[PDB]
Amino acid sequence: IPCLLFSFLTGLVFYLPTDSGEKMTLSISVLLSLTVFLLVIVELIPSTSSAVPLIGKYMLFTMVFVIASIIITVIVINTHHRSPSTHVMPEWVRKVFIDTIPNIMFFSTMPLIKHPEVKSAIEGIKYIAETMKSDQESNNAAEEWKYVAMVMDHILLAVFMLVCIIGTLAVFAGRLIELNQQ
């Protein structure tokens, strides 16, 4: 049961937004709880090397599941802070993660007084306007990457919950159906 609960917790990080500043805390703490529960398991389960116990297979599956969650979360977080100053959006990322998938979802693609001081003020107002125009352009470019990260988070939330269910069944269902079919 605790392994099942940790497996359920593994996929929860993909619904947590990156702007919370808590994705890595959640994932790493799930891993730490699993590591501490390894003490319980080494205490409670026989130390035999004749075969891998079914429950041991479930343990290793859950451990790999959490580690994969951490790796994929690092990828998502790296994607979410991609900026125009450092990265250029590839065309295939725009083709897939903006239009091909999100279209399925429900969101948004996302007199002459010439004087050294007066002329300076005129040029400065123009400069400020151009500055915030450029800032708006860069903000939109960053929001594109943020939307991409959000779409990956949704897809991989679905994938991780599905694989949690499937891997719970694939380890246990055989012997349980054998027992029920007695």
Partner 1 sequence: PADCGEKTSMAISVLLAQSVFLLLISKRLPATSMAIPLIGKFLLFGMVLVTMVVVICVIVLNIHFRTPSTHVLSEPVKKLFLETLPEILHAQQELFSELKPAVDGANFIVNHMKDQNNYNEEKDCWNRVARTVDRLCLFVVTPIMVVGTAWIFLQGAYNQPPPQPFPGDPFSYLEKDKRFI
Partner 2 sequence: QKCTVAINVLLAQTVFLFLVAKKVPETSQAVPLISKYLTFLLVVTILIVVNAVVVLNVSLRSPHTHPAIQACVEACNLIARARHQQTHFDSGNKEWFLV
Rounded distance, CA 88 to CA 114, Å? 43
Task: By CB under 8 A, tell whether 9 contacts partner 2.
Answer: yes
Which of residues 21 and 174 has its CB atom nearest to partner 1 in the complex? 21
Note the residues at the interface with ligand POV (CB under 6 A): 52, 57, 60-61, 64, 172, 176
Going by C-alpha positions, the residue among 166, 160, 175, 176 that lies closest to residue 9 is 160
Per rule CB under 8 A, is residue 53 in the interface with partner 2? no
- CB atoms under 10 Å from CB of 59, counted, come to 20
Q: Which of 61, 63, 17, 42 is nearest to 171 (CA)?
A: 61
Query: How far is residue 36's CA from residue 116's CA, in Å, rounded to a whole number?
Result: 71
Give CA 39 to chain center in angstroms. Answer: 29
> Per DSSP, which regions of 14-115 are E strands?
none
Angle separating helix axes 23-44 and 2-10, nearest 10 degrees = 160
The verdict on 138 binding partner 1 (CB under 8 A) reads no
Query: Taken in order 28, 30, 31, 33, is the CA torsion positive or negative?
Result: positive
Instruction: Check binding of 17 to partner 2 (CB under 8 A).
Output: yes
Q: Which does 42 bind (CB under 5 to 8 A by kind): partner 1, partner 2, ligand POV, none?
A: partner 1
Closer CB to ligand POV, 52 or 166, in the complex: 52
Contact residues toward partner 1 (CB under 8 A) are 18-19, 21, 23-25, 28-29, 31-32, 35-36, 38-39, 42, 74, 77-78, 80-81, 85-86, 111, 113, 117-118, 120-121, 124-125, 127-128, 131
Contact residues toward partner 2 (CB under 8 A) are 1-2, 5, 8-9, 12-13, 15-17, 19-20, 22, 25-26, 29-30, 32-33, 36-37, 39-40, 43-44, 107-108, 110, 122, 125-126, 128-129, 132-133, 136, 143, 147, 150
